[PDB]
Amino acid sequence: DPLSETKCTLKSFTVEKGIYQTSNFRVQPTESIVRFPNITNLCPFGEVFNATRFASVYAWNRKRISNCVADYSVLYNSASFSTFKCYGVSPTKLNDLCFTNVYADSFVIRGDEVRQIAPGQTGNIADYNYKLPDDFTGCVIAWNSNNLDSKVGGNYNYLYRLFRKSNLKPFERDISTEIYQAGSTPCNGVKGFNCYFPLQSYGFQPTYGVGYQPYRVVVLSFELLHAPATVCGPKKSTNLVKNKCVNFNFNGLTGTGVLTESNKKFLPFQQFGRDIADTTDAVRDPQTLEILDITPCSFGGVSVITPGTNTSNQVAVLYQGVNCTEVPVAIHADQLTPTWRVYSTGSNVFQTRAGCLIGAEHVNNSYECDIPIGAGICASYQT
Amino acid sequence: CFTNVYADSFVIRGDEVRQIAPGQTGNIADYNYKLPDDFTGCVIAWNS
Amino acid sequence: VSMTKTSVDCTMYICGDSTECSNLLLQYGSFCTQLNRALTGIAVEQDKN
Amino acid sequence: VTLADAGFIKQYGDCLGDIAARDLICAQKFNGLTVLPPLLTDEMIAQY
Amino acid sequence: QCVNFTTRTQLPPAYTNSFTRGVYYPDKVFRSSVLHSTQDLFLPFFSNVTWFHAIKRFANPVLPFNDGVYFASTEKSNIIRGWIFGTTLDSKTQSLLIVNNATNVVIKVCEFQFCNDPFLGVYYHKNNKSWMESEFRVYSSANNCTFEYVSQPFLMDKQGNFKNLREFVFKNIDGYFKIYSKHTPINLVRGLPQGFSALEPLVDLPIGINITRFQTLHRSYAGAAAYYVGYLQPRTFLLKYNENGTITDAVDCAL
Amino acid sequence: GAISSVLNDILSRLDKVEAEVQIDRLITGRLQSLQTYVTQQLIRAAEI
Amino acid sequence: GAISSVLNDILSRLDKVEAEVQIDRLITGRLQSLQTYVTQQLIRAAEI
Numbered sequence: 001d002p003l004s005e006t007k008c009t010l011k012s013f014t015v016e017k018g019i020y021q022t023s024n025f026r027v028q029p030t031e032s033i034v035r036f037p038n039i040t041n042l043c044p045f046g047e048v049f050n051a052t053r054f055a056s057v058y059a060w061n062r063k064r065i066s067n068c069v070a071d072y073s074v075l076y077n078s079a080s081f082s083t084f085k086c087y088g089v090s091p092t093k094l095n096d097l098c099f100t101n102v103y104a105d106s107f108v109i110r111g112d113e114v115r116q117i118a119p120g121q122t123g124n125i126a127d128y129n130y131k132l133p134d135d136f137t138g139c140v141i142a143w144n145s146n147n148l149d150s151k152v153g154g155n156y157n158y159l160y161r162l163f164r165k166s167n168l169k170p171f172e173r174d175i176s177t178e179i180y181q182a183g184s185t186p187c188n189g190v191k192g193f194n195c196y197f198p199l200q201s202y203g204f205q206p207t208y209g210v211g212y213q214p215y216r217v218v219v220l221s222f223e224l225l226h227a228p229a230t231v232c233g234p235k236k237s238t239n240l241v242k243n244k245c246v247n248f249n250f251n252g253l254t255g256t257g258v259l260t261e262s263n264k265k266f267l268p269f270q271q272f273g274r275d276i277a278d279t280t281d282a283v284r285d286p287q288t289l290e291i292l293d294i295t296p297c298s299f300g301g302v303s304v305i306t307p308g309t310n311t312s313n314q315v316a317v318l319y320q321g322v323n324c325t326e327v328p329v330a331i332h333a334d335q336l337t338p339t340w341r342v343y344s345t346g347s348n349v350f351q352t353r354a355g356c357l358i359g360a361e362h363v364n365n366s367y368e369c370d371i372p373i374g375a376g377i378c379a380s381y382q383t
Numbered sequence: 384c385f386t387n388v389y390a391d392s393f394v395i396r397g398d399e400v401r402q403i404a405p406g407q408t409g410n411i412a413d414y415n416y417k418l419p420d421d422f423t424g425c426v427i428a429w430n431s
Numbered sequence: 432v433s434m435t436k437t438s439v440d441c442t443m444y445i446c447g448d449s450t451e452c453s454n455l456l457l458q459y460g461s462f463c464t465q466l467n468r469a470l471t472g473i474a475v476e477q478d479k480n
Numbered sequence: 481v482t483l484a485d486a487g488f489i490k491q492y493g494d495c496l497g498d499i500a501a502r503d504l505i506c507a508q509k510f511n512g513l514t515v516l517p518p519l520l521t522d523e524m525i526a527q528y
Numbered sequence: 529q530c531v532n533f534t535t536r537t538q539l540p541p542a543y544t545n546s547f548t549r550g551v552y553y554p555d556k557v558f559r560s561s562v563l564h565s566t567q568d569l570f571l572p573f574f575s576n577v578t579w580f581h582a583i584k585r586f587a588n589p590v591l592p593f594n595d596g597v598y599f600a601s602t603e604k605s606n607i608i609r610g611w612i613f614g615t616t617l618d619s620k621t622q623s624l625l626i627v628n629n630a631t632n633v634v635i636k637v638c639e640f641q642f643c644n645d646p647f648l649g650v651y652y653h654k655n656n657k658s659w660m661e662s663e664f665r666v667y668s669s670a671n672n673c674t675f676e677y678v679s680q681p682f683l684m685d686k687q688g689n690f691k692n693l694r695e696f697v698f699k700n701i702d703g704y705f706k707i708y709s710k711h712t713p714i715n716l717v718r719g720l721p722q723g724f725s726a727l728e729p730l731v732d733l734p735i736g737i738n739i740t741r742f743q744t745l746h747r748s749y750a751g752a753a754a755y756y757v758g759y760l761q762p763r764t765f766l767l768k769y770n771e772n773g774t775i776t777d778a779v780d781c782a783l
Numbered sequence: 784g785a786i787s788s789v790l791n792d793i794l795s796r797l798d799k800v801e802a803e804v805q806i807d808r809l810i811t812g813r814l815q816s817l818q819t820y821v822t823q824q825l826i827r828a829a830e831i
Numbered sequence: 832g833a834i835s836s837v838l839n840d841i842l843s844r845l846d847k848v849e850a851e852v853q854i855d856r857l858i859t860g861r862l863q864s865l866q867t868y869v870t871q872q873l874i875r876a877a878e879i
């Protein structure tokens with residue numbers, strides 16, 4: 001009850017005469033909405049992970065995955081992946097999101113060098129032929145392929161780059177093979193002293209050691225919750241409901257609120273609109289392209305008026321900033337954070353400018369102010 | 384000195400041993416043997 | 432003579448409607464009660480003024 | 481002196497529209513910042 | 529087929545100020561009734577833009593692309609139909625070709641060897657009640673190629689009683705090439721139009737290449753048209769979104 | 784220094800272990816922002 | 832709690848992904864040192 005909440009907030013078994021702030025009330029959600037796009041075809045991860053032949057890391061190959069359903073649990077449960085490390089999501093959560101594009105980058109490197117695929121690293125791979133951006137969002141997936149991919153006298157198709165005038169930019173691809181003039185001399189023609197053909201091959205026989213063996217990398221890359229989505233986890237969508245407090249999820253933008261049809265006019269490329277506080281406050285539904293206002297579920301301050309425990313256990317409750325046409329909706333037809341209802345029974349309800357006071361009778365006599373409420377109103381204990 | 388001590392004993396594949404860390408997921412961590420996220424203890428494994 | 436009374440709900444500002452944020456905010460102890468108490472002190476002082 | 485709220489009855493349906501987007505009072509309210517009314521109304525100050 | 533038709537045809541560079549342009553919607557998020565701050569590659573307000581005008585026989589120079597470009601055309605009959613981007617333009621590196629041909633737009637990045645004058649042409653009104661673009665005289669080899677896309681004609685046309693203006697922004701950042709656009713009719717003789725508008729994002733392309741220098745492509749056959757080049761800079765802008773959520777004014781924070 | 788400023792983005796994009804490293808930064812920065820505001824307000828209240 | 836107080840020393844000896852975690856400590860401690868100075872100065876200004 002509200003008196004027990006004041007005792008708990010004061011950390012005392014006795015409360016003196018006064019008015020005390022307590023936990024803000026808030027209407028809790030009655031059901032869950034999920035709205036992903038109505039897309040049905042599975043994503044072609046087979047073409048990415050069961051490719052017959054991977055690219056050399058100097059010439060890493062990019063595939064673009066779109067308009068499809070991506071069950072990442074299928075990938076992540078496969079013990080085939082020796083490393084599966086994600087940098088702006090957790091692999092558990094991959095099924096609960098939608099992405100604006102997914103680019104899979106495929107290449108071969110030396111197993112000890114997989115360490116350099118992580119974002120912001122340094123060393124010859126991360127410097128000269130495949131660099132992730134510092135803010136990279138995605139998963140680096142790596143596995144040993146020696147038994148499929150190495151050959152008995154060796155495989156030698158797999159060039160890396162040993163030189164470059166400068167570091168490359170993130171997700172740059174350099175196919176130039178023009179001779180690297182390392183010395184002070186100019187160097188036309190295929191070689192020279194202190195002038196090198198800039199690509200050189202890994203040596204991979206199936207006998208060579210773990211860590212020196214050939215590893216296949218896929219890097220999955222994507223961006224989240226600021227743009228219109230096209231790749232999705234296998235989450236089933238549900239009937240969109242309005243004017244009720246609900247747990248929504250649109251394309252992975254989970255939240256709690258009341259949905260309503262807006263007069264906002266989102267440009268075709270927009271999917272979310274935001275308030276002053278960077279919070280999303282409108283959304284375009286991915287299955288019927290109307291723009292919905294999101295409002296937080298109705299809430300407010302609760303303050304408890306007490307004549308004090310030494311006088312009485314009777315208390316009165318101020319729902320501050322609330323018109324009490326709304327507090328009768330906070331009957332147990334839906335749930336609230338404060339579990340006590342009691343005063344919500346009504347009979348002695350009184351709208352003040354400060355919000356609605358429940359459990360105190362309104363009287364036309366004025367008196368000296370005993371417990372102050374606000375906006376001219378006070379309360380007191382009497383016969 | 385420890386208030387109660389329990390040793391939990393089992394065999395798994397060597398690549399699944401990573402799943403015995405707290406807060407993990409995968410077939411052993413999911414439907415077999417789950418540690419709590421506030422686990423206090425040691426996980427000890429050797430090739431058999 | 433006075434200034435606007437403000438009260439700031441520390442949980443709703445810091446952790447707005449998340450329980451698994453509220454369970455971390457509890458690990459900082461009394462600070463939200465100090466903030467509420469300080470702002471309540473200021474608010475009562477405005478009527479006193 | 482143009483005020484910026486006085487705590488009076490910002491009854492949530494005002495914060496349910498384009499009105500809510502143009503003003504910062506609804507953003508303050510939705511982020512747990514609430515203005516409260518003075519005990520004496522401007523009537524009572526005028527009477528004193 | 530490609531023939532080396534004479535010199536660069538004198539020095540055409542004119543100059544003018546960019547009064548109120550080259551601002552664009554900076555991200556895919558809706559906002560309204562807000563003065564919002566954004567830092568990225570923008571065309572500076574009142575910046576000294578280069579200007580080119582067709583006057584017969586024409587040429588388009590090689591232009592730098594440092595930190596990306598603003599490109600615009602004042603036009604009738606779509607005389608400008610695309611661009612080349614790269615760092616060598618002679619198959620020592622990859623390069624990106626964009627064209628709006630008579631069938632459709634094509635986007636392509638290959639080890640291109642361009643001709644010294646990349647150009648296209650039309651035979652005019654030749655009995656079929658049509659204007660056939662019978663000349664694709666742009667490149668001579670494309671050895672290795674790593675991305676290609678094709679779709680349709682990009683022709684947002686009534687009968688040109690006011691002259692067109694097409695506005696583009698090009699960026700090449702963290703391996704993505706980013707294209708923005710806007711179009712309007714305009715009613716000024718030669719000056720760039722004073723008044724506020726902002727570019728929408730149109731396409732994003734996973735090319736992953738060094739672009740140092742850029743160019744623009746003339747479609748050949750009496751076509752009178754002109755185009756403008758500005759250069760973006762890393763700057764901060766303040767944008768006023770109205771209640772409809774359109775950038776209605778801006779302030780360049782370093783003007 | 785968190786991956787996003789919006790609390791629900793962290794809680795949708797990360798699991799219970801890696802999320803709490805990010806939520807703690809938002810808690811630290813926001814709690815420092817309130818203690819700043821309440822210090823400004825207590826000092827102001829002494830002038831008023 | 833950083834490995835050094837010289838900002839360019841940090842930016843030399845560590846590579847970026849953990850150098851930024853060392854810089855985040857100097858940013859936090861120096862910003863706390865300024866919020867301290869400005870609080871003292873505001874309380875002093877009220878005495879003056």
Ligand SMILES: *[C@@H]1O[C@H](CO)[C@@H](O[C@@H]2O[C@H](CO)[C@@H](O)[C@H](O)[C@H]2NC(C)=O)[C@H](O)[C@H]1NC(C)=O
Nearest residue numbers: 322323324325326351352353488489490491493
């Ligand atoms: C509390 O809310 C109700 C609506 O839920 C308000 O009632 C309306 O008041 C206006 C102004 O007097 C009238 O034009 C409407 O006809 C009323 N509608 C209904 C259904 O009664 C009420 O005024 C609000 N109270 C306060 C103090 O704001």
Ligand SMILES: *[C@@H]1O[C@H](CO)[C@@H](O[C@@H]2O[C@H](CO)[C@@H](O)[C@H](O)[C@H]2NC(C)=O)[C@H](O)[C@H]1NC(C)=O
Nearest residue numbers: 529530531532533534535618642643644645668
């Ligand atoms: C057009 O003219 C240019 C010269 O202005 C020609 O370019 C030369 O081509 C030969 C091979 O035929 C090269 O050995 C020269 O080094 C080139 N010169 C330069 C400066 O690059 C070009 O071949 C001519 N093309 C046609 C089709 O006539």
Ligand SMILES: *[C@@H]1O[C@H](CO)[C@@H](O)[C@H](O)[C@H]1NC(C)=O
Nearest residue numbers: 045046049050074075078080
């Ligand atoms: C590769 O092929 C096998 C057999 O068809 C299939 O079961 C497996 O799922 C494929 N790999 C991936 C990563 O899906």
Ligand SMILES: *[C@@H]1O[C@H](CO)[C@@H](O)[C@H](O)[C@H]1NC(C)=O
Nearest residue numbers: 166167168169615738739740
């Ligand atoms: C791009 O090419 C130019 C000219 O060769 C060169 O100055 C620049 O360093 C190159 N940049 C990258 C990232 O390769």
Ligand SMILES: *[C@@H]1O[C@H](CO)[C@@H](O)[C@H](O)[C@H]1NC(C)=O
Nearest residue numbers: 037038039285286287288289
């Ligand atoms: C998705 O399915 C619904 C019918 O269930 C349909 O009305 C809607 O048009 C579809 N979405 C799109 C983008 O067409």
Ligand SMILES: *[C@@H]1O[C@H](CO)[C@@H](O)[C@H](O)[C@H]1NC(C)=O
Nearest residue numbers: 014307308309310311312313
């Ligand atoms: C309340 O306090 C008074 C002394 O101030 C005491 O006489 C009285 O018995 C107390 N009442 C109760 C119910 O404890």
Ligand SMILES: *[C@@H]1O[C@H](CO)[C@@H](O)[C@H](O)[C@H]1NC(C)=O
Nearest residue numbers: 350360361362363364365366
């Ligand atoms: C107070 O007076 C009004 C008339 O001004 C009357 O309608 C109302 O019923 C009275 N209230 C009580 C509690 O008697």
Ligand SMILES: *[C@@H]1O[C@H](CO)[C@@H](O)[C@H](O)[C@H]1NC(C)=O
Nearest residue numbers: 541542543544545575576577
């Ligand atoms: C800068 O603008 C003026 C016209 O205002 C122009 O004459 C001049 O050529 C431009 N600057 C350069 C370096 O061309």
Ligand SMILES: *[C@@H]1O[C@H](CO)[C@@H](O)[C@H](O)[C@H]1NC(C)=O
Nearest residue numbers: 629630631632634661664678
């Ligand atoms: C436009 O370009 C593409 C790619 O070269 C080609 O298939 C198409 O036939 C071209 N159209 C014309 C009119 O040449």
Ligand SMILES: *[C@@H]1O[C@H](CO)[C@@H](O)[C@H](O)[C@H]1NC(C)=O
Nearest residue numbers: 651653654655656657658660
């Ligand atoms: C008219 O079009 C046909 C193809 O349909 C072509 O063979 C013919 O040469 C064209 N006529 C002229 C005069 O260009």
Ligand SMILES: *[C@@H]1O[C@H](CO)[C@@H](O)[C@H](O)[C@H]1NC(C)=O
Nearest residue numbers: 265769770771772773774776
């Ligand atoms: C906003 O859009 C409506 C409907 O198109 C229009 O009537 C109104 O004039 C627009 N606002 C402005 C400032 O023009």
